[PDB]
Design a protein around this ligand. Structure first.
Ligand code: MG
Ligand code: MG
Ligand code: MG
Ligand code: MG
Ligand code: MG
Ligand code: MG
Ligand code: MG
Ligand code: MG
Ligand code: MG
Ligand code: MG
Ligand code: MG
Ligand code: MG
Ligand code: MG
Ligand code: MG
Ligand code: MG
Ligand code: MG
Ligand code: MG
Ligand code: MG
Ligand code: MG
Ligand code: MG
Ligand code: MG
Ligand code: MG
Ligand code: MG
Ligand code: MG
Ligand code: MG
Ligand code: MG
Ligand code: MG
Ligand code: MG
Ligand code: MG
Ligand code: MG
Ligand code: MG
Ligand code: MG
Ligand code: MG
Ligand code: MG
Ligand code: MG
Ligand code: MG
Ligand code: MG
Ligand code: MG
Ligand code: MG
Ligand code: MG
Ligand code: MG
Ligand code: MG
Ligand code: MG
Ligand code: MG
Ligand code: MG
Ligand code: MG
Ligand code: MG
Ligand code: MG
Ligand code: MG
Ligand code: MG
Ligand code: MG
Ligand code: MG
Ligand code: MG
Ligand code: MG
Ligand code: MG
Ligand code: MG
Ligand code: MG
Ligand code: MG
Ligand code: MG
Ligand code: MG
Ligand code: MG
Ligand code: MG
Ligand code: MG
Ligand code: MG
Ligand code: MG
Ligand code: MG
Ligand code: MG
Ligand code: MG
Ligand code: MG
Ligand code: MG
Ligand code: MG
Ligand code: MG
Ligand code: MG
Ligand code: MG
Ligand code: MG
Ligand code: MG
Ligand code: MG
Ligand code: MG
Ligand code: MG
Ligand code: MG
Ligand code: MG
Ligand code: MG
Lengths: 172, 136, 191, 106, 197, 290
RNA sequence: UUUGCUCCACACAAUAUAGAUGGAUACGAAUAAGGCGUCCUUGUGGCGUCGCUGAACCAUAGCAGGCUAGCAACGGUGCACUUGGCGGAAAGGCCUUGGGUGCUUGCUGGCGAAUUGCAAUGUCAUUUUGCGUGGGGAUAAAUCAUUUGUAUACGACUUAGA
RNA sequence: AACUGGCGAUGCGGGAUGAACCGAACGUAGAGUUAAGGUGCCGGAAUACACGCUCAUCAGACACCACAAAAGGUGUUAGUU
RNA sequence: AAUUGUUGAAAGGGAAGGGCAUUUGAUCAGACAGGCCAGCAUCAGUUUUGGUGGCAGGAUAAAUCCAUAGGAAUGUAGCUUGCCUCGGUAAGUAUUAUAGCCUGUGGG
């Protein structure tokens, strides 16, 4: 949807005479700005409680900065998505350095692999994976072997002028 | 008669691999690969160079042939301490790569007169060498 | 899903020296020398010790990694093909007309001249591939034997003969005539 | 000595245009060795000259010049728009043009 | 930037070379392309052979003369790719095309001239490794181009006379490199060292 | 719609345009593949069609109902007095095809060939080749270099020869001149051969022997403007038809809305170049021979 | 038919120009590899080194580059000559010998520059043709008409004619 | 047939092309900024950046729009139990 | 007037003619004696593109950094064991030791 921020959002059915101080419910929402994030908040709240923006009220809307933004983390991600033929539940695993960075690339993968646009996707849970060997998918497990190294063959260097008088070399 | 099988010895993505940034507010600065995120992202940190610890796409950086003993995941202070230890900056500064860089930085900073001064010197150097290229 | 590194081992015997610049392989052992071009295939060879060589694929998909093993195999068969060598035995079969095979030569050629196939008046010829020797086995009836260092040159010179004797316009389950490969193996015995 | 050039070499690319309508009032100039917008903001305001020859002598010369000025940058590749006392003649598309160093500011 | 730009066609992807050659033309830049027969095309040989036959079947029904014209030679194949990217029925288009010459092999003049290469059309830099491609001289030969053997013959000879050229040249730069060494450490030298030279 | 009854087209499309040929002497568009192991001689000869006659012979065809029996067969007779060699021409291979780089000529040129280079012999000063003839005067110098260039280069060697047309009943004087590829060993031998034969003469038997299969290459007799019926062998339209019946009724369908190339129209018939092959030589007569 | 034609030279004139303005600066090949230097056992060799762009390399100071003196070098470069050699893919260009001559900013001197007035491309490229001058060289043909008939609606084709 | 908006009566930018779609409604002009739609070359405008996917011996390529289905695949990709 | 001849000028690769614009050629008005045009400077209106300074919010950013307690493994030192060209490997113990990392709390 853009580059993502993560918000804590809090709202509560409008106070009534006979029921003042209603319950307060929170969601963590991944959106690109605070306006979309409250649109989203209300989107899901109406999928659980009887409320709608018209009869409720946001109480607090707060960015949640990554606690350890240079600590490489193995994330497990849980997602609901509709495909063309129907609607399904997935679990993927993203190895990035901050929840917000990873939710970003999830959305890329869903779009690339399963053609799911943003509207069709429900993040259900994103959480850090504490022990290794709770990592399931192998496209992550690769990157947790000990003393790991790898080269980057066939190096291509972006030419700056239209012509060239050498003849390139993909060496690295 | 032994076997004799080529080589192809690549620079590697690995912890403690020093890496020349090429685009950003760092760009032209060295830095080291702390941990390793995936096939295309890495975690770099170059506290000596002033470049901040970050996750960087490997496309915006170029692997140098320098390496040093660095524990995977090592924080910035640890990085600063191991870097100085291996004496990275001298190791790089003295290399034909980093000298060629400084050499063109200089030719860019030449004043119009200094540029005129280079011409006469080359005139002088050429006179004696074109001579020597005729006596042996 | 792009596997980061996978390699295979190419074991090397005492009587052989393989040499690989770019991906042009040359193996020389007792039986002689074989060379094979691998430029089409994008793998990384790495010596470890005159009895061991490795081939690797970095960041490769299925279709690529799946081509890694078959590079090993190919170089293996070059190695064995030059120590032991290869020997393919085929045995004529016919239901009434004796298939009549010989080795004819027009212009230093060496051919495999099959006559009377299914009683044909036609004279079939298969060319003898350089690197393969054809002996007609003594002590066994209607046998032919192709031997050489190149598996691929023998198995083919083999197969080109069996196919020159395909049976047209008859029920090929009843009319089993032909020449068929009956045993594929090495040249040096015990092994 | 051998060189005397006090200008930067140039090329008359197109008029300013849409897909299907051009505007002869603005030429688009390609300045040799200027490759980004940031590079080409140096040349903004420099005077341009398109020198050309003719058969009729005039003020005692057979050489004539249409004068202009770089006025703004164009796109991302250091192309530059410019206007002239009289629009450039559309045959000049691909001709050489002279971008001078004045009004300087060094 | 230079009066003429000689492009060694070898190793470039047709439409990408055609595309930069086209623009260069229209911007006033004279260009000759050499070694058009060592040009490349993405996709394997058979696809591009078929593709060529599709092109080959179009012609003016009532008179196969007036209809489209199917040139076989790798240069002309290339020219077609190239003319397709120029407003070639305008005067300006004909203007620009005259600034262009395509050649099989490297004939006189341009064999002594240095030829350059176009990184953004270089196949070895462009095509994903593992992709299949096509050589233009092979393609051209399968569709009636006559002269693939004569060109390779003349080229092999030309490469022989050029390997000598290089060899003599590398021998002489060894003197110059040795001369410049004794002049190093001198006063001129460390002064120029200072000024970046 | 669809024909009605299918039937094959009239005429062969690989002979268009059915126009007049550019010259009486049809061109040899091809010469035999060269075998540089044999002696060198000509690969084609020049003659004049004289007439036809009948021949009787025993046929030797084991299996045919006419084995060992007499047949009568028709044969043409070509008048064939020795061609006289007067030049060699060397060709080099180029990526744009075969190019001729030089031609060395004999020093002495018959008025027959010299006539060929003129349109008005009688009035002309006949200075043709006279300055070339000088080139021999000096030692030889320049003729050698050219002859030497030809050996140095040239993938192909051909010989300019011309006919002794005055040894022929014709009224026509102006002789015929033509290149003939030489197919014997070694480039250098071929030019050596031709230089040796300048002004000298060459005979038919040294090209053709008995029972050899040779091809003929001439210009079909001409008939001028020709209707569609005889020219293309089109059906005559019925008798009842208005405005003529040696026509083609339907010139074409409505679309493509043009008459097409593949449709027989009237036009020139004859004076076409033809390369006829596989004509066996039954007799190589010698003139000095009652 | 009014001294015509051609190649070299200069002179004046015209007429051009898809667009000079320091230099188109020559291996080949590979790219999951190579260039260069070096050593050897001359190899699919040992060792070293380089790349990460031509941001190079070469040239570049002097009335658009004037007039002049000297030194140190024996080098460089322009020009016309001459020795030997190479190049046919469109070679029409490349290399080498020897003297003659100009320049040299390698370094050190004498003189000059203004008033083009505070900018006005400020004119220095190369196209073709034309007219006389004189230093070499050369002295035809085709067409109408006539004629053949291997050709032809007419043109055209193919013949013949001191 | 219904409600609105349009074309008809209407040019201008886009959709190559096109009455009705998208954008936007017109006095004569200058400077600027945009819409819809674009920016390899034709063609003004990043052979821009980023993560995936796809190799098709009839690949695919942007609304209206110039068509394709049931059913299959041990091609490859991520998923579910 | 259509249309035609001559002369002069000019253009013409499957029509011609038209719009905006400019080169070139031809042609002509007016104005100078403040007329035509420019250049720079200081301003005014509109606008475009840079450099740089002072501040406000947030978990009074989150981090890094330092201090502290705890912890584990893609286990660093040591130790043990087993081969193994005199140590190097491998598999065991082993949580800071001859690397370090993670987590919480506190400070600026
Ligand atoms: Mg929402
Ligand atoms: Mg809802
Ligand atoms: Mg949903
Ligand atoms: Mg780029
Ligand atoms: Mg190497
Ligand atoms: Mg510089
Ligand atoms: Mg059957
Ligand atoms: Mg049957
Ligand atoms: Mg244009
Ligand atoms: Mg524009
Ligand atoms: Mg104007
Ligand atoms: Mg134009
Ligand atoms: Mg143009
Ligand atoms: Mg131009
Ligand atoms: Mg057509
Ligand atoms: Mg085209
Ligand atoms: Mg043009
Ligand atoms: Mg590539
Ligand atoms: Mg039918
Ligand atoms: Mg019937
Ligand atoms: Mg032919
Ligand atoms: Mg021929
Ligand atoms: Mg019979
Ligand atoms: Mg000649
Ligand atoms: Mg006549
Ligand atoms: Mg007739
Ligand atoms: Mg008749
Ligand atoms: Mg007939
Ligand atoms: Mg009737
Ligand atoms: Mg009929
Ligand atoms: Mg027709
Ligand atoms: Mg022009
Ligand atoms: Mg070369
Ligand atoms: Mg070499
Ligand atoms: Mg090397
Ligand atoms: Mg070497
Ligand atoms: Mg030796
Ligand atoms: Mg060697
Ligand atoms: Mg080596
Ligand atoms: Mg260089
Ligand atoms: Mg001077
Ligand atoms: Mg002086
Ligand atoms: Mg002296
Ligand atoms: Mg001197
Ligand atoms: Mg030639
Ligand atoms: Mg040429
Ligand atoms: Mg020549
Ligand atoms: Mg001199
Ligand atoms: Mg000078
Ligand atoms: Mg001047
Ligand atoms: Mg004269
Ligand atoms: Mg007379
Ligand atoms: Mg509407
Ligand atoms: Mg209405
Ligand atoms: Mg209306
Ligand atoms: Mg409207
Ligand atoms: Mg429009
Ligand atoms: Mg639109
Ligand atoms: Mg459309
Ligand atoms: Mg829209
Ligand atoms: Mg709408
Ligand atoms: Mg086009
Ligand atoms: Mg553009
Ligand atoms: Mg950009
Ligand atoms: Mg298709
Ligand atoms: Mg099909
Ligand atoms: Mg079909
Ligand atoms: Mg296609
Ligand atoms: Mg749709
Ligand atoms: Mg389906
Ligand atoms: Mg599937
Ligand atoms: Mg499911
Ligand atoms: Mg036409
Ligand atoms: Mg006008
Ligand atoms: Mg007055
Ligand atoms: Mg006034
Ligand atoms: Mg003015
Ligand atoms: Mg202002
Ligand atoms: Mg600020
Ligand atoms: Mg603060
Ligand atoms: Mg503690
Ligand atoms: Mg460590």
């Amino acid at each position: 949807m853009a580059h993502f921020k993560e918000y804590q959002v809090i709202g509560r059915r409008l106070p009534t005479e006979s029921v003042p101080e209603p319950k307060l419910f929170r969601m963590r929402i991944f959106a690109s700005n605070e306006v979309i994030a409250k649109s989203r908040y209300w989107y899901f709240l109406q999928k659980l409680h009887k409320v709608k923006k018209a009869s409720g009220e946001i109480v607090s809307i707060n960015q949640i900065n990554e606690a350890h933004p240079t600590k490489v983390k193995n994330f497990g991600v849980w997602v609901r998505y509709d495909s063309r033929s129907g609607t399904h539940n997935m679990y993927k695993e993203i190895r990035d350095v901050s929840r917000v960075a990873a939710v970003e690339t999830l959305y890329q993968d869903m779009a690339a692999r399963h053609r799911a646009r943003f509207r069709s996707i429900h993040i259900l849970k994103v959480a850090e994976i504490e022990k290794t060997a709770d990592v399931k998918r192998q496209y992550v497990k690769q990157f947790l072997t000990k003393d790991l190294k790898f080269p980057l063959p066939h190096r291509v260097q972006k030419s700056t002028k239209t012509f060239s008088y050498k003849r390139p070399s993909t060496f690295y | 008669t032994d076997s004799i099988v080529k080589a192809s010895n690549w620079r590697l993505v690995e912890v403690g691999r020093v890496v020349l940034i090429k685009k950003g507010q760092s760009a032209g600065k060295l830095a080291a690969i702390v941990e390793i995120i995936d096939q295309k992202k890495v975690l770099i940190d170059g506290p000596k160079a002033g470049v901040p610890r970050q996750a960087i796409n490997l496309g915006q950086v170029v692997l140098t042939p320098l390496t040093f003993a660095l524990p995977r995941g090592a924080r910035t202070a640890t990085v600063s301490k191991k870097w100085a230890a291996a004496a990275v900056c001298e190791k790089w500064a003295a290399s034909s790569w980093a000298k060629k860089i400084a050499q063109r930085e200089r030719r860019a900073a030449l004043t119009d007169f200094e540029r005129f001064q280079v011409m006469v010197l080359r005139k002088q150097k050429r006179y004696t060498v074109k001579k020597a290229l005729a006596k042996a | 899903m792009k596997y980061i590194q996978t390699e295979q081992q190419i074991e090397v015997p005492e009587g052989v020296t393989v040499s690989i610049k770019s991906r042009i392989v040359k193996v020389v052992g007792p039986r002689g020398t074989l060379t094979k071009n691998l430029k089409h295939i994008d793998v990384t060879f790495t010596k470890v010790n005159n009895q061991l060589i490795k081939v690797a694929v970095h960041n490769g998909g299925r279709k690529h990694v799946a081509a890694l093993r078959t590079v090993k195999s190919l170089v293996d068969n070059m190695i064995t093909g030059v120590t032991k060598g290869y020997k393919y035995k085929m045995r004529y079969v016919y239901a009434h007309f004796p298939i009549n095979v010989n080795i004819v030569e027009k212009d230093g050629a060496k051919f495999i001249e099959v006559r009377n196939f299914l009683g044909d008046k036609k004279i079939r010829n298969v060319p003898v591939r350089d690197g393969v020797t054809i002996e007609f086995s003594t002590n066994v009836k209607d046998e032919i034997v192709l031997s050489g260092n190149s598996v691929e040159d023998v198995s083919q010179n083999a197969a080109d003969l069996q196919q020159i004797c395909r049976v047209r316009n008859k029920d090929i389950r009843k009319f089993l005539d032909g020449i068929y490969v009956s045993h594929k193996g090495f040249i040096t015995e015990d092994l | 000595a051998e060189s005397h050039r006090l200008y930067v070499k140039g090329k008359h690319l197109s008029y300013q245009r849409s897909k299907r309508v051009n505007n002869p009032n603005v030429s688009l100039i390609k300045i040799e060795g200027v490759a980004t917008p940031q590079d080409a903001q140096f040349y903004l305001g420099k005077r341009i000259a398109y020198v050309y020859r003719a058969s009729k002598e005039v003020r005692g010369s057979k050489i004539r010049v249409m004068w202009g000025k770089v006025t703004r940058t164009h796109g991302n590749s250091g192309v530059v728009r410019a206007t002239f006392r009289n629009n450039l003649p559309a045959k000049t598309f691909g001709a050489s043009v002279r971008i001078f160093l004045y009004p300087s500011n060094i | 930037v230079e009066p003429v730009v000689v492009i060694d066609g070898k190793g470039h992807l047709v439409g990408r070379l055609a595309s930069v050659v086209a623009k260069q033309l229209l911007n006033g830049q004279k260009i000759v392309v050499v070694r058009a027969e060592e040009l490349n095309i993405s996709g394997e040989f058979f696809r591009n052979k078929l593709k060529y036959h599709d092109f080959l079947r179009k012609a003016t029904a009532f008179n196969k003369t007036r209809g489209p014209f199917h040139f076989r030679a790798p240069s002309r194949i290339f020219y077609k790719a190239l003319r397709g990217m120029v407003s070639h029925k305008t005067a300006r288009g004909k203007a620009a095309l005259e600034r262009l010459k395509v050649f099989e092999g490297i004939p006189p003049p341009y064999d002594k001239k240095k030829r350059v290469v176009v990184p953004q059309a270089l196949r070895v830099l462009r095509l994903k490794p593992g992709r299949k491609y096509t050589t233009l001289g092979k393609l051209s030969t399968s569709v009636g181009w006559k002269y693939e053997d004569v060109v390779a013959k003349l080229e092999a000879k030309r490469k022989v006379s050029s390997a000598e050229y290089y060899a003599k040249k590398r021998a002489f730069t060894k003197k110059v490199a040795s001369a410049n060494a004794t002049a190093a450490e001198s006063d001129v030298a460390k002064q120029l060292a200072a000024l970046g030279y | 719609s669809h024909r009605k009854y299918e039937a094959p087209r009239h005429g062969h499309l690989g002979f268009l345009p059915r126009k007049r040929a550019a010259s009486i002497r049809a061109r040899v568009k091809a010469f035999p593949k060269d075998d540089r192991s044999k002696p060198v001689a000509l690969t084609s000869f020049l003659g004049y069609k004289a007439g036809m006659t009948t021949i009787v012979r025993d046929l030797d065809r084991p299996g045919s109902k006419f084995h060992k029996r007499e047949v009568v067969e028709a044969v043409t007779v070509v008048d064939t007095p020795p061609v006289v060699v007067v030049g060699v021409v060397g060709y080099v291979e180029t990526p744009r095809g075969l190019r001729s780089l030089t031609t060395v000529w004999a020093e002495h040129l018959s008025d027959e060939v010299k006539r060929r280079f003129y349109k008005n012999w009688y009035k002309s000063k006949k200075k043709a080749f006279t300055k070339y003839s000088a080139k021999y005067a000096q030692d030889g110098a320049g003729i050698e270099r050219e002859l030497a260039r030809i050996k140095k280069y040239a993938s192909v060697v051909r010989v300019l020869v011309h006919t002794q047309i005055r040894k022929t009943p014709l009224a026509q004087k102006k002789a015929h001149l033509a290149e003939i590829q030489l197919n014997g060993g070694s480039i250098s031998e071929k030019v050596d051969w031709a230089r040796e034969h300048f002004e000298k003469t060459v005979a038919v038997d040294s090209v053709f022997e008995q029972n050899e299969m040779i091809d003929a290459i001439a210009v079909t007799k001409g008939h001028g403007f020709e209707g569609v019926t005889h020219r293309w062998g089109t059906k005559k339209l019925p008798r009842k038809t208005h405005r003529g019946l040696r026509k083609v009724a339907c010139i074409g369908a409505w679309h493509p809305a043009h008459v097409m190339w593949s449709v027989a129209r009237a036009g020139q018939r004859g004076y076409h170049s033809r390369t006829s092959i596989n004509h066996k030589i039954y007799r190589v007569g010698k003139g000095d021979d009652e």
